[PDB]
Structure formats: C-alpha cells, structure tokens
Design a protein around this ligand. Structure first.
Ligand SMILES: CO[C@@H]1[C@@H](n2cc(-c3ccc(Cl)c(F)c3F)nn2)[C@@H](O)[C@@H](CO)O[C@@H]1Cc1cn([C@@H]2CCOC[C@@H]2F)nn1
Ligand SMILES: [Cl-]
Length: 138
C-alpha cells in the first residue's frame, strides 16, 4: 500500500496491449477519485469519478492541453461505492483507452493525445486507500 497522491512511472510511455491495474479501497465518505495519464504538463486522459456532482454520481473524462481542459465525456454508469475495494483496469488499445472496473467494462476514451510513447506518468489521487499500481503486457 501507498499514500496518495502517487505517480506510477510509465517509461517510454504507453503502448497497445499494456494493461494497467489499480487496486484500492474507496474512503467511507468519498467525493472524488482521479487517474491522470500525463504527457509532461498535458493530461492525455483524466478519469474522474465524482460521487456528489449536483447530488449525482458521474464519471467525467477529459484531456488537458496547454493547461486548458477540453471537451468532457460523461458517463452515468458508476461502479464505485464508498468504503468498498475496487479494481480499475486501463487497457491501452491502438485508438483508445479501455476502462474496466471490478472486471466489468466501463468506457472507452479515444486518444486525443497521439504520442502514446510520451505518456510517461500515471497520477493517482482522490479519496482512496491505494493498495497496488502495476502494469503488464497481455
Ligand atoms: C475542479 O477541476 C476539475 C478538474 N480537476 C479535478 C482535479 C482533481 C484534483 C485532485 C484530486 Cl484528489 C482529484 F480527485 C481531482 F479530480 N483536478 N482538476 C477536472 O476534473 C476537469 C475535467 O474536465 O474538470 C474540472 C476543471 C474544469 C472543467 N472545465 C470545463 C467544464 C465544461 O467542459 C469544458 C471544461 F472541461 N473547466 N475547468
Ligand atoms: Cl490526493
């Protein structure tokens, strides 16, 4: 286990067939979780479960370029629960990131940042206890 926030290094960036597994437990009174796939200051893929946005639960995904947030992709399917252990898996595919939570497909996010080999850090933050952060090639 590690104390958030934590940066998982991704040397030489990501590549198709790379499967990243984040294990943790959501804190009892959680407001938000965030994964940030970074290319320097740019955020290629921000995955942001929000427990209480306008008294609703929503997943927000976005890209940050030149310090500006772009078009949000939103999803009401919300597999997380306060207090509960989770597994987030991010499969890097040629054209998108594929996200599954607790072995169930959640969403796909098309690559806006094209230089996968430059996406060299994964930031993990928010209202979680982080157990594990690792990757393998499938
Ligand atoms: C509050 O900041 C968030 C941002 N955010 C969230 C965090 C974070 C920090 C720490 C922890 Cl522990 C953690 F969980 C975190 F989510 N940091 N930055 C991010 O979620 C962003 C996703 O679009 O939305 C907000 C920023 C934002 C969005 N937009 C518009 C909205 C209309 O559409 C076009 C633009 F997107 N303008 N600014
Ligand atoms: Cl944090």
């Amino acid at each position: 286990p590690l104390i958030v926030p934590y940066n998982l290094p991704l040397p030489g960036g990501v590549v198709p067939r790379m499967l990243i597994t984040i294990l943790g437990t959501v804190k009892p009174n959680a407001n938000r979780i965030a994964l940030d796939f970074q290319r320097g200051n740019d955020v290629a893929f921000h995955f942001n479960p929000r427990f209480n946005e306008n008294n609703r639960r929503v997943i927000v995904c976005n890209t940050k370029l030149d310090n500006n947030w772009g078009r949000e992709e939103r999803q009401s399917v919300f597999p997380f629960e306060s207090g509960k252990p989770f597994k987030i898996q991010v499969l890097v595919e040629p054209d998108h990131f594929k996200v599954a939570v607790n072995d169930a497909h959640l969403l796909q996010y098309n690559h806006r940042v094209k230089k996968l080999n430059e996406i060299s850090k994964l930031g993990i933050s928010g209202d979680i206890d982080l157990t594990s952060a690792s990757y393998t090639m499938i």
